[PDB]
A paper describes a structure:
The simplest model to account for these effects is that each aspartate residue helps to position the arginine side chain for interaction with the non-bridging phosphoryl oxygen atoms. To further explore the effects of the aspartate residues on the R166 functional unit, we solved the crystal structure of [name]/[name] AP. In the other monomer, R166 was observed to populate two rotameric positions, one of which is similarly flipped away from the active site while the other is pointed towards the active site. In both active sites of [name]/[name] AP, the bound Pi is not well positioned, populating multiple conformations that are each distinct from its position in WT AP, which likely closely mimics the reactive phosphoryl conformation. These structural comparisons provide evidence that the aspartate residues that flank R166 help to correctly position the reactive phosphoryl group and provide a self-consistent picture of the functional effects of the D101/R166/D153 functional unit.
We have therefore investigated the functional behaviors of an interaction network hypothesized from available structural data in the [name] [name] (AP) active site. We observed three overlapping functional units, D101/R166/D153, D153/Mg2+/K328, and D101/Mg2+.
Numbering used by the authors:
A (entry chain B), B (entry chain A): 9 to 451
Write the structure that this text describes.
Amino acid sequence: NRAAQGDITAPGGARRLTGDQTAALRDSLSDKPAKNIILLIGDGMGDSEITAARNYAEGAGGFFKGIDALPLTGQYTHYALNKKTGKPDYVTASAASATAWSTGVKTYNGALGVDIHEKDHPTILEMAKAAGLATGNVSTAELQAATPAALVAHVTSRKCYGPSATSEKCPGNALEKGGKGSITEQLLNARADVTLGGGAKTFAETATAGEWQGKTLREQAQARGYQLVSDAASLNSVTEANQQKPLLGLFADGNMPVRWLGPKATYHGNIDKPAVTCTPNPQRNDSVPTLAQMTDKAIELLSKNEKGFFLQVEGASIDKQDHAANPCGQIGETVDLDEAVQRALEFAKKEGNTLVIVTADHAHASQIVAPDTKAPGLTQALNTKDGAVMVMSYGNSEEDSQEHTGSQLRIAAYGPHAANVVGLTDQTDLFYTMKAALGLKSA
Amino acid sequence: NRAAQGDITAPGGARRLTGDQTAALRDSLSDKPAKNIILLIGDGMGDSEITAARNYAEGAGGFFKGIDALPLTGQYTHYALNKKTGKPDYVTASAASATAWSTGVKTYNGALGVDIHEKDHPTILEMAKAAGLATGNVSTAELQAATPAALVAHVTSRKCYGPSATSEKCPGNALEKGGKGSITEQLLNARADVTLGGGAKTFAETATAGEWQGKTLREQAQARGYQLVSDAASLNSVTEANQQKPLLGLFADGNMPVRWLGPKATYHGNIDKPAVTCTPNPQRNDSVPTLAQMTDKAIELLSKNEKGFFLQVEGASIDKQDHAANPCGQIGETVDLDEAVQRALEFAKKEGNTLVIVTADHAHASQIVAPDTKAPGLTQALNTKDGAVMVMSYGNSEEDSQEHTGSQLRIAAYGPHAANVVGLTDQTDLFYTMKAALGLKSA
Ligand SMILES: [Zn+2]
Ligand SMILES: [Zn+2]
Ligand SMILES: [Zn+2]
Ligand SMILES: [Zn+2]
């Protein structure tokens, strides 16, 4: 627990610590093997995003019971590479960074599972499966999106969702040109035990070559023995997931809907408009599973494997709402991820041999600024849990989409090998940290 | 060493880690008492600020030999309080934050060494002195500024620099009105062994009351046994500092000048103006000591105390140049601080009982964004050590001063009791962390 201990107005009332941590931290240092690993990613969830969410939902002296509860903490770098020069591109996006932590190799913006020479490298999920471990891959984004795709697809551009776009934009990857295929096709080949998110639309496409040509990717998946689920009840009803009967969850056409509604931030929004209170999204159908609900079934099913499992969970629409300059959406999805993180930590503490890691792919735009702020970008004032006004600014783009930022950001871990995120690290160190904790070996 | 291990374009080339860190971290953890403490403060040095400076000066896969070399890392919160309501004010400035880590109590923006009720609370420096330890207070800002002042003065507004402004803005603190006096006057009463910085301008004021009425504050310091120095040569000539002969260095009228020159960022600066390469500041002559030079002498002098010392070092102009939207100024002062930190770490490793801490009072405005970025605020393109462009954006103020931000930010530490910065903590925990490490007590 790291909430403020009492009266924040009085001596010692805002302390998050009750005593000395040296002994407690020594007991958090284990070098034994990790049987399991859970990696939780908030896209765009930099330190600013975390703090804003905490201030709003739990108050400034509050405490995220998931996100803030991991004891070993550091800052890590996530610069991408310029494809032509091989020099740092200081502001990454999902693909290059997901490639980075999943392969241990830097690459260029747009690349999935390939280096700057367009050459494939194996992913941590692929290596876990080879060693006999179960594998899970979960995202509130469409499943073709870069973060979940990176674990199961190798392509020259992240836009190559299905056969149609792959033939056009990844000619070398296309199936009818001898390549491994589209993101969705490769995801089906990768055959993770558990795969849950959105992105049903691309599954409507039919493959133009290969053993299942003329069939929709939906039909292919079924033909190859996958269980299809599309809402929370059916997901819940699933009792097993393995190589004979892998689980595919498709819970929306595109991205899964956000939990909180609020107005878009506006020019002089914190001056011209009144303080905003977030409400639940009334357009989110009740049958859509939450990130934590998806995480529950995943952990339940994957943990059946005696040898162990690897699971990745992505809170995606933190980035998306950050891009859209929508604090309520953005905070809402940070709250959504905290729930999922709680599930993973609850499992991990009971099981005793699980490494849980929580971080983001890169920083983003949202900044917490003073209430009187008069800024050139998009701003909005919110009513927090404290009963006080917080203002948020998005001031790095004139166009309709607010931009990523290149600042280093928090990485936190719990369990075996958690030490390897403390201090300054690079995103690629996370690959090798995970590789080493599971005792995995290159083919 | 946490630099990129090799060729950043190849597998494992961007790794900052050479192996498992568990055994290394176990060694780093000591609960024995700290004999000395060095607290280094980069004013406004958020994780964005650290990253931008590293990217520029050392390249993306580079490594600050001071700043990035502290092994025990975390994230801490620095929200202030609204004076009337006692609820969090989410974006602090230096007075409230410096007051928080120096007293262990939160307070309102503008308050120095007092709580929201205007009650005085003792500072870590005052308590150190009381216990017999030696005390140092070093800054590139004018010494009246909130970060160094917070250790030695208790006033209701940080603007109460000297008698003149105190009578008007802190009438209850004014000396002629029964109070302890202006910041400068209370500083002279506090009588730290070592006090180095700018702010000579205010010492030209005369006191309106008390034992040294009619005399200038400079004359007062002379009469009370202080050694005054005004340049690097004289500073170096000083052989001892103690309560019989305290040292006061005044190296500029106001703030000490910055190392690096570069143009101010502008609207569409990264588009319409060429990439910038920082140069040395021609109007900072070498007779003005650097922060590391001041840190050297301070460490030399204070370390002669058998019982131990407390030293605070502030790189003030990271904040100032961040406000002025000047990447070169801002980055140059971040480099300036890294040197001072190196001096602190070198001493700490040899001595073996010194706790060193590096952090910032709060986050700031500067953001690292993509080169093609088209932002509404002030931007600039810069040529890095990597031979690639990094753009910086300042997008939270339409007036002539870019604003702080509330994001939690990095705290790092080395030595005895350094475990207490790991995980999430509050800026006030830092007070209690330092107090316990030295074993200090209350009256
Ligand atoms: Zn992203
Ligand atoms: Zn994004
Ligand atoms: Zn400051
Ligand atoms: Zn400032």
